[PDB]
Design a protein around this ligand. Structure first.
Ligand code: BR
Ligand code: BR
Ligand code: BR
Length: 185
Protein backbone atom coordinates (compact mmCIF):
# COMPACT_ATOMS: atom_id res chain seq x y z
CA UNK A 1 0.00 0.00 0.00
CA UNK A 2 1.00 3.62 -0.54
CA UNK A 3 3.01 4.19 -3.71
CA UNK A 4 2.25 0.61 -4.76
CA UNK A 5 1.00 0.51 -8.33
CA UNK A 6 -2.67 -0.41 -8.57
CA UNK A 7 -3.12 1.15 -5.11
CA UNK A 8 -6.66 2.35 -5.87
CA UNK A 9 -7.53 -0.99 -7.49
CA UNK A 10 -6.45 -2.82 -4.33
CA UNK A 11 -8.24 -0.54 -1.89
CA UNK A 12 -11.32 -0.90 -4.12
CA UNK A 13 -12.15 2.82 -4.04
CA UNK A 14 -12.01 5.21 -7.02
CA UNK A 15 -10.94 8.83 -6.90
CA UNK A 16 -13.25 10.70 -9.26
CA UNK A 17 -13.18 14.09 -10.96
CA UNK A 18 -16.39 16.12 -11.38
CA UNK A 19 -16.46 19.16 -13.67
CA UNK A 20 -19.33 21.63 -13.34
CA UNK A 21 -19.52 24.87 -15.29
CA UNK A 22 -17.81 26.69 -12.40
CA UNK A 23 -15.57 24.21 -10.57
CA UNK A 24 -13.68 20.97 -10.90
CA UNK A 25 -14.10 18.74 -7.84
CA UNK A 26 -12.34 15.69 -6.46
CA UNK A 27 -13.83 12.99 -4.23
CA UNK A 28 -13.85 9.23 -3.67
CA UNK A 29 -16.45 6.68 -4.75
CA UNK A 30 -16.82 2.90 -4.38
CA UNK A 31 -19.49 0.21 -4.80
CA UNK A 32 -20.53 -1.84 -1.77
CA UNK A 33 -22.83 -4.63 -2.98
CA UNK A 34 -23.65 -2.60 -6.14
CA UNK A 35 -24.79 0.43 -4.18
CA UNK A 36 -22.52 3.47 -4.58
CA UNK A 37 -20.84 4.91 -1.53
CA UNK A 38 -19.17 8.32 -1.76
CA UNK A 39 -16.78 10.09 0.58
CA UNK A 40 -19.37 11.89 2.71
CA UNK A 41 -22.10 11.67 5.31
CA UNK A 42 -25.89 11.85 5.44
CA UNK A 43 -26.40 11.49 1.70
CA UNK A 44 -24.13 14.47 1.04
CA UNK A 45 -20.87 14.13 -0.91
CA UNK A 46 -17.71 15.89 0.33
CA UNK A 47 -15.91 17.60 -2.57
CA UNK A 48 -12.43 19.12 -2.74
CA UNK A 49 -10.96 21.73 -5.06
CA UNK A 50 -7.65 19.93 -5.55
CA UNK A 51 -6.00 16.54 -5.28
CA UNK A 52 -3.81 17.86 -2.43
CA UNK A 53 -6.85 19.05 -0.47
CA UNK A 54 -8.42 15.57 -0.71
CA UNK A 55 -5.15 13.98 0.42
CA UNK A 56 -4.96 16.34 3.43
CA UNK A 57 -8.55 15.52 4.43
CA UNK A 58 -7.84 11.79 4.21
CA UNK A 59 -5.01 12.19 6.74
CA UNK A 60 -7.25 13.62 9.50
CA UNK A 61 -9.48 11.37 11.57
CA UNK A 62 -13.05 11.76 10.34
CA UNK A 63 -16.28 9.79 10.54
CA UNK A 64 -17.93 9.31 7.15
CA UNK A 65 -19.54 6.58 5.05
CA UNK A 66 -16.17 5.13 3.93
CA UNK A 67 -14.32 5.10 7.27
CA UNK A 68 -15.52 1.65 8.46
CA UNK A 69 -14.48 0.08 5.13
CA UNK A 70 -11.73 -2.51 5.48
CA UNK A 71 -9.23 -0.95 3.04
CA UNK A 72 -9.82 2.63 4.22
CA UNK A 73 -7.11 2.27 6.89
CA UNK A 74 -4.79 1.76 3.89
CA UNK A 75 -6.01 5.11 2.53
CA UNK A 76 -5.57 7.11 5.77
CA UNK A 77 -2.22 5.50 6.59
CA UNK A 78 -0.92 6.32 3.11
CA UNK A 79 -2.23 9.86 3.64
CA UNK A 80 -0.25 10.17 6.87
CA UNK A 81 2.84 8.65 5.22
CA UNK A 82 2.83 11.04 2.29
CA UNK A 83 2.71 8.11 -0.12
CA UNK A 84 -0.93 8.66 -1.16
CA UNK A 85 -1.14 9.47 -4.87
CA UNK A 86 -4.58 10.74 -5.91
CA UNK A 87 -5.02 9.79 -9.56
CA UNK A 88 -8.27 9.81 -11.54
CA UNK A 89 -8.49 7.42 -14.47
CA UNK A 90 -10.14 8.59 -17.67
CA UNK A 91 -13.35 6.61 -17.16
CA UNK A 92 -13.70 8.33 -13.77
CA UNK A 93 -13.89 11.83 -15.30
CA UNK A 94 -17.45 13.20 -15.15
CA UNK A 95 -18.22 16.38 -17.07
CA UNK A 96 -21.60 17.91 -16.21
CA UNK A 97 -20.90 21.33 -17.72
CA UNK A 98 -22.24 22.26 -21.14
CA UNK A 99 -24.93 19.57 -21.24
CA UNK A 100 -27.61 22.20 -20.48
CA UNK A 101 -26.59 24.22 -23.55
CA UNK A 102 -26.27 21.10 -25.74
CA UNK A 103 -29.71 19.71 -24.80
CA UNK A 104 -31.29 23.02 -25.92
CA UNK A 105 -29.63 22.53 -29.33
CA UNK A 106 -31.12 19.04 -29.61
CA UNK A 107 -29.78 15.51 -29.38
CA UNK A 108 -27.25 15.84 -32.20
CA UNK A 109 -25.34 18.50 -30.24
CA UNK A 110 -25.01 16.21 -27.19
CA UNK A 111 -21.92 14.06 -26.89
CA UNK A 112 -22.83 10.41 -26.31
CA UNK A 113 -19.82 9.37 -24.24
CA UNK A 114 -20.06 12.53 -22.12
CA UNK A 115 -23.75 11.96 -21.41
CA UNK A 116 -23.18 8.25 -20.68
CA UNK A 117 -20.67 9.11 -17.97
CA UNK A 118 -22.78 11.97 -16.63
CA UNK A 119 -25.85 9.73 -16.28
CA UNK A 120 -23.74 7.15 -14.44
CA UNK A 121 -22.68 9.81 -11.92
CA UNK A 122 -26.19 11.21 -11.63
CA UNK A 123 -27.76 7.80 -10.88
CA UNK A 124 -24.96 7.04 -8.43
CA UNK A 125 -25.65 10.33 -6.66
CA UNK A 126 -29.39 9.70 -6.45
CA UNK A 127 -28.64 6.17 -5.20
CA UNK A 128 -26.28 7.31 -2.42
CA UNK A 129 -28.58 10.15 -1.32
CA UNK A 130 -31.60 7.79 -1.52
CA UNK A 131 -33.44 10.38 -3.61
CA UNK A 132 -35.50 9.49 -6.66
CA UNK A 133 -34.92 12.82 -8.45
CA UNK A 134 -32.57 11.37 -11.06
CA UNK A 135 -34.45 8.10 -11.47
CA UNK A 136 -37.79 9.82 -12.11
CA UNK A 137 -36.32 12.48 -14.41
CA UNK A 138 -34.79 9.78 -16.64
CA UNK A 139 -37.94 7.71 -17.15
CA UNK A 140 -38.45 7.33 -20.89
CA UNK A 141 -41.97 8.77 -20.70
CA UNK A 142 -40.53 12.18 -19.56
CA UNK A 143 -38.92 14.77 -21.88
CA UNK A 144 -35.39 14.51 -20.45
CA UNK A 145 -35.43 10.72 -20.17
CA UNK A 146 -36.69 10.39 -23.74
CA UNK A 147 -34.02 12.77 -25.03
CA UNK A 148 -31.40 10.95 -22.95
CA UNK A 149 -32.45 7.48 -24.15
CA UNK A 150 -32.33 8.66 -27.76
CA UNK A 151 -28.83 10.15 -27.50
CA UNK A 152 -27.48 7.09 -25.68
CA UNK A 153 -28.82 4.68 -28.34
CA UNK A 154 -27.38 5.26 -31.85
CA UNK A 155 -29.81 2.54 -33.07
CA UNK A 156 -32.83 4.78 -32.35
CA UNK A 157 -35.07 6.38 -34.95
CA UNK A 158 -37.88 7.88 -32.83
CA UNK A 159 -36.18 11.27 -32.72
CA UNK A 160 -37.29 13.93 -30.21
CA UNK A 161 -38.60 16.91 -32.16
CA UNK A 162 -37.69 20.53 -31.29
CA UNK A 163 -37.93 22.73 -29.23
CA UNK A 164 -36.32 21.08 -26.21
CA UNK A 165 -37.28 23.51 -23.44
CA UNK A 166 -38.85 20.76 -21.33
CA UNK A 167 -35.69 18.63 -21.37
CA UNK A 168 -33.58 21.68 -20.51
CA UNK A 169 -35.86 22.53 -17.58
CA UNK A 170 -35.74 18.99 -16.20
CA UNK A 171 -31.94 19.00 -16.59
CA UNK A 172 -31.58 22.30 -14.72
CA UNK A 173 -33.57 20.74 -11.84
CA UNK A 174 -31.08 17.86 -11.77
CA UNK A 175 -28.15 20.26 -11.68
CA UNK A 176 -29.69 21.97 -8.64
CA UNK A 177 -30.27 18.54 -7.09
CA UNK A 178 -26.58 17.74 -7.70
CA UNK A 179 -25.40 21.04 -6.19
CA UNK A 180 -27.40 20.39 -3.02
CA UNK A 181 -25.79 16.94 -2.61
CA UNK A 182 -22.25 18.37 -2.67
CA UNK A 183 -20.61 19.54 0.54
CA UNK A 184 -17.57 21.72 -0.11
CA UNK A 185 -14.39 21.63 1.98
BR1 BR B 1 -37.24 15.78 -25.97
BR1 BR C 1 -41.31 18.76 -17.74
BR1 BR D 1 -23.56 20.93 -10.16
Amino acid sequence: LGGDRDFWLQVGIDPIQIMTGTATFYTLRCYLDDRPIFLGRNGRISVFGSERALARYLADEHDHDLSDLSTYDDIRTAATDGSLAVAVTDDNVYVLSGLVDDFADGPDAVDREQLDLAVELLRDIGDYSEDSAVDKALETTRPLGQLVAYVLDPHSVGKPTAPYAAAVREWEKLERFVESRLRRE
